[PDB]
Amino acid sequence: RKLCSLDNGDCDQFCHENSVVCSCARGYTLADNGKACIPTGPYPCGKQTLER
């Protein structure tokens, strides 16, 4: 029953709706839990550059 209109369906990035599918931008991989987005490199899009 989850919906994208409630805490973005618990997704870190993209949410899409008879149940919710999370997805991620290029340079990230969708976690095993189907929610989180993992950076596949040190300079992933949209991340400010703070350590390193």
Partner: protein, 233 residues
């Protein structure tokens, strides 16, 4: 940028500057990847030949991260015109790839439907640039950023001596003296969602800077998401 604040270290890494033959900044760009820069089509007429500089926060201070990249190709939106300023978008491909590092990194492109229901519906976006600090003022040697509220389309249309198409959106303040300004055009408008920044607009145009009753006008990137993809391949 009128008002706002100096971009702190590492906080506007997708910022690019387009530089004159005399090595003066005249427009911004948004880094999209190692080979591509998003900018505004109308920025293309204001200089015959130019390059793009990244990793710079202080044009008067060589930090050690600067890198100047020449343009291999220019892909202007074939429907852009000076008459309308509509479709004010363009992609640049760089001869040499960017090396991402401190202060140099790309902003994310969103999925369109989600960006419409989730990004464009936030309260605010962030715009950044080395542009003037007041209308009749002069460019700032330091990279500034400014949080600008989304402005509803009807208010946008009413406030404007010019036609606002569906490829355009308003951001900023009615009376508050904060806004993008001359020299920021082409530069980023990005929207944060859970600590990730997504490209939402391209600085396009304004009637002055920070004028009362007037807002900043931006290219609506959700309308050019498939176009940017094809432009990049």
């Amino acid at each position: 940028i009128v008002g706002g604040q100096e971009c702190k270290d590492g906080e506007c890494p997708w910022q690019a500057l387009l530089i004159n033959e005399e090595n003066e900044g005249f427009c911004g760009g948004t880094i999209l990847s190692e080979f591509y820069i998003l900018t505004a089509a109308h920025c293309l007429y204001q200089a015959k030949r130019f390059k793009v500089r990244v990793g710079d926060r202080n044009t008067e201070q060589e930090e050690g991260g600067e890198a100047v990249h020449e343009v291999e190709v220019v892909i202007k939106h074939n429907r852009f015109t000076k008459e309308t300023y509509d479709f004010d978008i363009a992609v640049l491909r760089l001869k040499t790839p960017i090396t991402f590092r401190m202060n140099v990194a790309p902003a994310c492109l969103p999925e369109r439907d989600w960006a419409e229901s989730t990004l464009m519906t936030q309260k605010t976006g962030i715009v950044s640039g080395f542009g003037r600090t007041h209308e009749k003022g002069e460019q700032s040697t330091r990279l500034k950023m400014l949080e600008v509220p989304y402005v509803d389309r009807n208010s946008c249309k009413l406030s404007s001596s010019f036609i606002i198409t569906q490829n355009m959106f308003c951001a900023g303040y009615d009376t508050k003296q904060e806004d993008a300004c001359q020299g920021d055009s082409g530069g980023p408008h990005v929207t944060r969602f859970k600590d990730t920044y997504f490209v939402t607009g391209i600085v396009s145009w304004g009637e002055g800077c920070a004028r009362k009753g007037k807002y900043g006008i931006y290219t609506k990137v959700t309308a050019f998401l498939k176009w940017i993809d094809r432009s990049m391949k």
